[PDB]
Design a protein around this ligand. Structure first.
Ligand SMILES: Nc1ccn([C@H]2C[C@H](O)[C@@H](COP(=O)(O)OP(=O)(O)OP(=O)(O)O)O2)c(=O)n1
Ligand code: SF4
Ligand SMILES: [Ca+2]
Ligand SMILES: [Ca+2]
Ligand SMILES: [Ca+2]
Ligand SMILES: [Ca+2]
Ligand SMILES: [Ca+2]
Lengths: 111, 469, 959
DNA sequence: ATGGTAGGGGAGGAA
DNA sequence: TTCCTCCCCTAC
């Protein structure tokens, strides 16, 4: 469900919203919602929020300046990206187990 | 109010599928013959850098003459002493009009000279030398070499067009001071054929260049990961706009490191990170990696593809035989054929060096007819490089090459519909048309300084950009 | 062709109303068919050119060569009838040749015997060659007449006829002569013997010979003709005149002191396409080519046929070729119509110039200034090939066409022949540019005007002839004769000067340097040393001279008389020669161009070898007038001046006298004293050196002068006559880095050592980081051991010698080259070689670089590291770090694939740069570039990088 | 015919 | 293995 001790707090490495897809097998259009409700209510301790912003012209920016840019229109979606309560920066990535993809299967078999 | 816009952007579709979708299959032309491909064996470095020039002249003489028979024709009546005729560049005298063909060769003072560096014991220094031309000195000379002769050129035209070395275009002028020309008209070679592409069920291509990964992480790795996530459709609505992107094309400068200091340490961690990204992205998109100038590949321009050894063990399943459709690893200037749309791509060094010729250096005044600053002049340089049939004019002279013998791959044989040049500082596109044939010149920008990745449609050829930050 | 022939003579020209005034460039003895003037028929022909550009052939008629003998000591010697019977007897014996015997009162040049003048007999002869026979007869004693000269006598004033006329009339070489209006006669067109425009004849009493100072110091419009030839030789065999033709002959005739030549030609053997700016006389056969070239020279009438290696190769080749082609009228192209040019091989040996065999050709009336000889005399360089001297002086390395491709270029078509023609034009315009830059004519004109020898002696004979000429002129001024002394076959040596023991070490204190201006000349002028001031103890007792007032006893015990008694002539000669050096140094003081200040520095450094050679004259046992009592008496007086300076500065600038530190003279070589004042400041060390120069010069007699020369803030005194430091003249910026003797300024050390030592010294002395210096040293030792130094940096050069006892590497190499190619280096040519690897002895193991670059033989690296680079570097780094460290200095698949791929990425970026710089150099973008300018940096490098890139790519193929 | 002497340093050969 | 001639070159 929402195993939020080792998913956020003791998750001390910054937790990406794709880790939800890879672990809980949840979908992106649902993992964003899980992160959403989490930071809305479940939060109890200090946690830094990082949010992506995609516009009509397809611009993808994350710094989001905490105040605004022409958001008064042109914003298609605004998904809550990774959290970093450790607050510094710089996650690290690696090989990831596939076969959990609802995005798209490329075209071909790996042979 | 940041929280309320989040609340509004609550999308909660919640299916999107289990049911992974499939990208639209756009397949490169199966490996038949790549003119830019040289195995490391059979490279005979014995010959000199003169078979290249001889072949260029020998092949462009016909291309220029097929146009010069009609324009400047044998009965052309220029003001007086009509055109008298062709000649051999040295066999010219008098003030009568005349026209010959020759491989222009510039002579600038700031073009770095290796003999001077050796005699000054300063060989091996940083080669910053931002530009070659001497604008504030006017000392730049533009000769017209041929088989036997070297005629200096002066006039007004050499202030209009670039006139880059190595190119072979027939000139027409009046001998002024027994050594120079007074250029009057320039003949570019005959138009070159294209391939026909049928109008019809979709297609796109994600172009990206200048990744420049290293140990330092000023958002570079994070921008790359956001890129793969957006290419996964995980950043936007799932399909119908990202489901069909088809293929990625990394266009060089993927791994940037300091050769001068690191001693090959970071050049491995960068490659491991790059292989992590490739393993994360390959089950979803096919990828074609193309070596740049700052990459584990040759410095000679026909750079051969990346080696399988550079990549992590994780990707070994991809490097198995009969899997070129997933990962490609092509030579640097490559002639793809994606669903019939012949797209020719470069790492972007040729245009960089051409601009080094034309653009001035630190001057220490503003010209509109000249003084290419950097906005559209780069697209004009690519236009010329599609007029001048070869795609690397100053090849042996300033952007070094394997000293070919009896063949030069750079001189074009047929125009491609698309001509992508990489690592350009600015993004631009022009649907140029010359000789009844039209091509599309896309100029992909760097993915390090900027965030743009171009999405080129393969049925309307109207590329669009998407900026990542 | 309306520009060739000189300015036409004025129409209204007659022997009256005009004063032919011209500059004489040449002079040679000849006989003049016609009436004997003043009982003699021989004449001296003064070729020259007047101010407007007309040629001249003034024949100076009427001079009779004379021989001086002391009047025999007898009673009848004062009887006129006896003298007349004597000249009668001589005419009986010596072919009616002796004219008369004048009685003149002269004195000898040897010693101050008093103010009384002996009576001498001036024996005139009709033709000047008779004086040699007469002198031999007088010296042996064959004359038998009243027991006068039966024992034997010593003759006087032994000098050639031409120089005798030039001395008596007062004509220095390259000076101005004015034939007065109406005093001269013109040779009628029937009896003309030359091609010159004005061919006159004057009596020697009439002509006015101006001194070369004042209004008569300018120079006439000479016509310098440079040229060059190229021969089409058989394959693999050097061009031999008997079988290999001359195919082209360039020409760059020009006027002296002009910006650009006014003639260019190329006489080709076949048809040649036109070149812009240069006529092309294309002939059909070689005989016609040679004859037309001769006619061309005769029509142009150049004055100075300059070239590069023309004396040894070009002109002899042309002459032997014309001889082999039965062209009989070719070899007559001097200013005289019917004198054949012939080759006379002569050898010149000297300590300062070395043995070298030359093939002199007698082009009568025209100077010759083969630039090879001029440079081999004036400049010390590693090699003297045209490429290398052009790269050194002009600063340009240009293509040098391959030898074997000359035959193909010739037998191709008119375009290839135009290519040959432009090559020849470059080769022929090179010597003229060199002559204009180096200022050959101007310097040699000053030398021939100051000394007195003709211009032809400056490049064909040593310094003794200059001293002889100046001596004879001064003696003639002062009524003196020079006794003919048979050479004292040899000696061992006399005493030299003192080289103070060095306090070796590395000094961070400033090191002042106090030296004397022209030491030995100043001593000679100061203490009146001369031949005519020499004296002995008996003479002092006879004449009753007083000490320190009329004579001085030199620290060698020899006596000389003060200027109150006599004024020696060597003071006067030296005065002129070091007062001309002052006005040659008053020019580079006012010179801005940096390359002009190392040519105006080669003019003050040639009038200081010419003043220190007046001493060497007195010191040379072999060679006339050797007096080892003026020459071993300046070395003393030079050994008691450093011994007095090193004792005065060391004991004045001490703590007792109110100073901060005790001064210490750490070194000093024959005049200098590298005093270390003890202060760290540099503006104070210079301020003390300047004060010391004044105080010490106060102790000696005028003109002896000690001046503060330079300073060295960092100083590295390796050994005796070897050191290095920074050259400071003003206390705010250093001028350069001096290396006095170290293996970097030697020329028998590979260029690698020079470069390494210069960089090491630069770091240690200027940059002051010793650790960075050592790191570079270790970096080089790896390069040598891994074969990463280019052959251009491993070439050693030594001067071949005439004969050897202990075999030398370059000597065996020269023999082997002669055996391989058919021609090898001659005596006096520097031989270039690198030491290949092997087991047999060193001398058997040395090869021509072009043989190493054509057979890939392995350059011995252990030898270079151990012998060449080790000891110099150790010697210069041991003072800083101590000897121990110095000697110590010389005693998975992925990461593997990143290597051999960032190595090829460094070789294929140098390969292209080099093999496209060759194209930018030859200018030939479209055809093959075959270069053989083996004195080019990139030479030996392009092939190495190619052989390395091929191998590295072959190796990278495997992965 | 040919200016001088002092002196370092390399190669090698004999005792 | 230590002097002791040649031999080249330079410094003054
Ligand atoms: N080619 C030479 C150089 C020098 N000396 C002798 C005579 C000098 O008087 C003395 C001094 O040597 P220098 O090199 O210092 O020459 P000078 O000091 O005489 O000239 P200057 O002081 O003007 O530099 O050495 C010589 O006999 N032959
Ligand atoms: S080798 Fe190259 S750089 Fe050297 S002279 Fe020849 S062309 Fe010039
Ligand atoms: Ca020549
Ligand atoms: Ca001195
Ligand atoms: Ca001195
Ligand atoms: Ca001085
Ligand atoms: Ca010694």
């Amino acid at each position: 469900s929402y195993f939020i001790n080792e998913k956020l707090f003791t998750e001390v490495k910054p937790v990406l919203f794709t880790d939800l897809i890879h672990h809980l097998k949840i979908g992106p259009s649902m993992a964003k919602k899980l992160m959403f409700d989490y930071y809305k209510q479940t939060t109890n301790a200090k946690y830094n929020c990082v949010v992506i912003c995609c516009y009509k012209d397809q611009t993808i920016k994350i710094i989001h300046d905490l105040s605004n840019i022409p958001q008064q229109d042109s914003i298609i979606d605004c998904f809550i990206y990774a959290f970093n309560p450790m607050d510094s920066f710089i996650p690290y990535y690696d090989i990831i187990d596939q076969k959990d993809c609802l995005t798209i299967k490329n075209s071909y078999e790996l042979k | 109010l940041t929280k309320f816009n989040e609340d509004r952007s609550l999308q909660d579709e919640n299916l999107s599928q289990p049911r992974t979708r499939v990208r639209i299959v756009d397949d490169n032309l199966y490996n038949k013959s790549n003119p830019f491909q040289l195995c490391y064996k059979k490279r005979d470095y014995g010959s000199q850098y003169y078979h290249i020039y001889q072949y260029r002249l020998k092949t462009f003489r016909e291309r220029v003459l097929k146009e010069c028979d009609k324009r400047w024709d044998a009965g052309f009546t220029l003001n007086g002493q009509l055109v008298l005729k062709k000649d051999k560049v040295l066999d010219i005298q008098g003030n009568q009009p005349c026209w010959c063909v020759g491989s222009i060769y510039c002579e600038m003072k700031y073009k770095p000279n290796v003999l001077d560096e050796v005699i000054n014991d300063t060989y091996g220094a940083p080669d910053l030398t931002k530009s070659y031309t001497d604008k504030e000195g006017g000392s730049d000379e533009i000769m017209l070499e041929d088989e036997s002769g070297r005629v200096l050129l002066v006039g007004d035209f050499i202030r209009s067009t670039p006139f880059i070395t190595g190119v072979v275009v027939g000139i027409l002028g009046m001998e002024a001071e027994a050594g120079t020309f007074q250029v009057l008209d320039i003949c570019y070679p005959t138009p070159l054929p294209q391939n026909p592409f049928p109008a019809p069920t979709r297609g796109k291509i994600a172009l990206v260049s200048g990744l420049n990964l290293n140990n330092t992480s000023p958002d570079r790795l994070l921008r790359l990961e956001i890129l793969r996530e957006f290419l996964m459709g995980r950043i936007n609505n799932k399909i119908d706009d990202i489901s069909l992107i088809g293929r990625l094309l990394i266009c060089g400068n993927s791994v940037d490191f300091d050769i001068k200091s690191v001693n090959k340490d970071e050049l491995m961690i960068s490659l491991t990170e790059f292989s992590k990204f490739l393993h994360n992205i390959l089950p979803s998109i096919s990828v074609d990696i193309m070596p740049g100038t700052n990459d584990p590949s040759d410095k000679s321009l026909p750079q051969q593809p990346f080696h399988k050894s550079l990549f992590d063990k994780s990707l070994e399943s991809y490097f198995n035989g009969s899997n070129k459709e997933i990962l490609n690893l092509v030579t640097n200037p490559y002639e793809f054929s994606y669903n019939g749309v012949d797209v020719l791509a470069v790492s972007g060094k040729n245009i960089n060096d051409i601009c080094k010729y034309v653009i001035p250096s630190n001057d220490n005044e503003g010209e509109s007819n000249d003084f290419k600053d950097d906005i559209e002049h780069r697209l004009d340089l690519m236009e010329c490089t599609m007029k001048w049939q070869n795609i690397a004019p100053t090849a042996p002279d300033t952007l070094w090459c394997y000293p070919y013998t009896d063949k030069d791959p750079f001189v074009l044989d047929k125009w491609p519909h698309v001509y992508i040049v990489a690592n350009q500082p600015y993004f631009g596109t022009r649907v140029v048309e010359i000789g009844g044939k039209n091509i599309k010149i896309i100029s992909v920008p760097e993915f390090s300084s900027t965030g743009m990745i171009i999405l080129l449609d393969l049925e309307t050829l109207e590329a669009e950009t998407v900026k990542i930050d | 062709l309306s520009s060739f022939e000189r300015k036409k003579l004025p129409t209204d020209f007659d022997p009256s109303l005009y004063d032919i005034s011209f500059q004489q460039i040449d002079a040679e003895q000849s006989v003049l068919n016609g009436i004997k003037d003043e009982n003699t028929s021989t004449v001296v022909r003064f070729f020259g050119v007047t101010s407007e550009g007309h040629s001249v052939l003034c024949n100076v008629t009427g001079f009779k060569n004379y021989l001086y003998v002391p009047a025999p000591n007898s009673s009848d010697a004062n009887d006129q009838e006896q003298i007349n019977k004597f000249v009668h007897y001589l005419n009986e014996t010596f072919d009616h040749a002796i004219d008369s015997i004048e009685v003149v009162s002269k004195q000898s040049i040897w010693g101050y015997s008093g103010d009384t003048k002996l009576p001498f007999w001036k024996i005139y002869v009709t033709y000047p060659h008779m004086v040699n026979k007469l002198r031999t007869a007088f010296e042996r004693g064959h004359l038998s007449f009243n027991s006068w000269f039966s024992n034997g006598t010593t003759t006087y004033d032994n000098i050639a006829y031409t120089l005798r006329l030039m001395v008596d009339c007062g004509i220095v070489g390259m000076s101005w002569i004015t034939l007065p209006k109406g005093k001269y006669s013109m040779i009628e067109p029937n009896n003309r013997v030359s091609s010159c425009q004005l061919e006159v004849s004057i009596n020697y009493r009439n002509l006015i010979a101006h001194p070369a100072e004042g209004d008569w110091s300018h120079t006439a419009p000479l016509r310098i003709m440079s040229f060059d030839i190229e021969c089409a030789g058989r394959i693999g065999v050097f061009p031999e005149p008997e079988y290999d033709p001359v195919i082209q002959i360039a020409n760059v005739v020009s006027i002296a002191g002009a910006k650009k030549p006014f003639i260019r030609n190329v006489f080709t053997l076949n048809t040649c396409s036109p070149i812009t700016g240069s006529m092309i006389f294309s002939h059909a056969t070689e005989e016609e080519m040679l004859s037309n070239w001769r006619n061309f020279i005769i029509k142009v009438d150049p004055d100075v046929i300059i070239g590069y290696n023309t004396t040894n190769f070009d002109i002899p080749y042309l002459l032997n070729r014309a001889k082999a082609l039965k062209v009989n009228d070719f070899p007559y192209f001097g200013r005289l119509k019917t004198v054949k040019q012939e080759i006379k091989e002569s050898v010149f040996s000297s300590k300062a110039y070395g043995t070298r065999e030359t093939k002199n050709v007698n082009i009568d009336g025209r100077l010759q200034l083969d630039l090879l000889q001029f440079i081999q005399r004036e400049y010390k360089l590693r090699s003297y090939t045209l490429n290398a001297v052009s790269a050194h002086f002009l600063g340009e390395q240009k293509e040098d066409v391959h030898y074997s491709i000359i035959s193909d270029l010739q037998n191709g078509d008119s375009e290839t022949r135009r290519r040959l023609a432009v090559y020849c034009l470059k080769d022929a315009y090179l010597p003229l540019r060199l002559m204009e830059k180096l200022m050959a004519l101007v310097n040699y004109t000053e030398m021939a005007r100051v000394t007195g020898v003709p211009f032809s002696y400056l490049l064909a004979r040593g310094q003794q002839i200059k001293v002889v000429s100046q001596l004879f002129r001064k003696c003639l001024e002062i009524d003196t004769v020079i006794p003919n002394m048979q050479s004292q076959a040899s000696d061992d040596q006399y005493e030299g000067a003192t080289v103070i023991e060095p306090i070796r070490g590395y000094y961070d204190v400033p090191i002042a340097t106090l030296d004397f201006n022209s030491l030995y000349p100043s001593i000679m002028m100061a203490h009146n040393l001369c031949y005519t001031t020499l004296c002995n103890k008996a003479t002092v007792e006879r004449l009753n001279l007083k000490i320190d007032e009329d004579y001085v006893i030199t620290p060698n015990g020899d006596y000389f008389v003060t200027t109150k008694r006599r004024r020696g002539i060597l003071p006067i000669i030296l005065d002129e020669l070091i007062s001309a050096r002052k006005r040659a140094k008053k020019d580079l003081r006012d010179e801005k161009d940096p390359f002009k200040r190392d040519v105006l520095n080669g003019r003050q450094l040639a009038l200081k070898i010419s003043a220190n050679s007046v001493y060497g004259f007195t010191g040379a046992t072999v060679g006339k007038l050797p007096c080892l009592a003026i020459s071993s008496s300046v070395t003393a007086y030079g050994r008691t001046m450093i011994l007095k300076t090193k004792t005065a500065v060391q004991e004045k600038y001490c703590i007792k006298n109110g100073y901060k530190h005790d001064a210490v003279v750490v070194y000093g070589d024959t005049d200098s004293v590298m005093v270390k004042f003890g202060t760290t400041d540099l503006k104070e060390a210079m301020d003390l050196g300047t004060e010391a120069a004044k105080y010490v010069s106060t102790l000696f007699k005028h003109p002896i002068n000690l001046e503060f020369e330079k300073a060295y803030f960092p100083y590295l005194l390796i050994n005796k006559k070897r050191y290095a430091g920074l050259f400071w003249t003003n206390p705010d910026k250093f001028d350069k880095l001096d290396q006095k003797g170290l293996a970097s300024v030697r020329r028998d050390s590979c260029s690698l050592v020079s470069i390494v030592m210069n960089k090491v010294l630069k770091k240690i002395l200027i940059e002051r980081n010793v650790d960075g210096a050592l790191a570079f040293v270790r970096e080089t030792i790896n390069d040598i051991l891994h074969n990463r130094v280019d052959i251009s940096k491993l070439i050693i050069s030594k001067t071949l010698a005439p004969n050897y006892t202990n075999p030398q590497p370059h000597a065996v190499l020269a023999e082997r080259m002669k055996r391989r190619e058919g021609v090898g280096p001659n005596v006096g040519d520097r031989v270039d070689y690198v030491i290949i690897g092997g087991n047999d002895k060193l001398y058997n193991r040395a090869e021509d670089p072009l043989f190493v670059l054509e057979n890939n033989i392995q350059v011995d690296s252990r030898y270079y590291l151990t012998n060449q680079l080790q000891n110099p570097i150790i010697s210069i780094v041991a003072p800083i770090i101590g000897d121990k460290q110095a000697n110590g200095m010389f005693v998975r698949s992925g990461e593997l694939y990143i290597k051999a791929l960032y190595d090829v990425r460094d070789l294929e970026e140098k390969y292209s740069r080099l093999w496209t710089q060759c194209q930018r150099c030859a200018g030939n973008l479209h055809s093959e570039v075959l270069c053989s300018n083996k004195n080019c940096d990139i030479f030996y490098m392009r092939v190495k990088v190619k052989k390395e890139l091929q191998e590295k790519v072959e190796q990278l193929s495997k992965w």
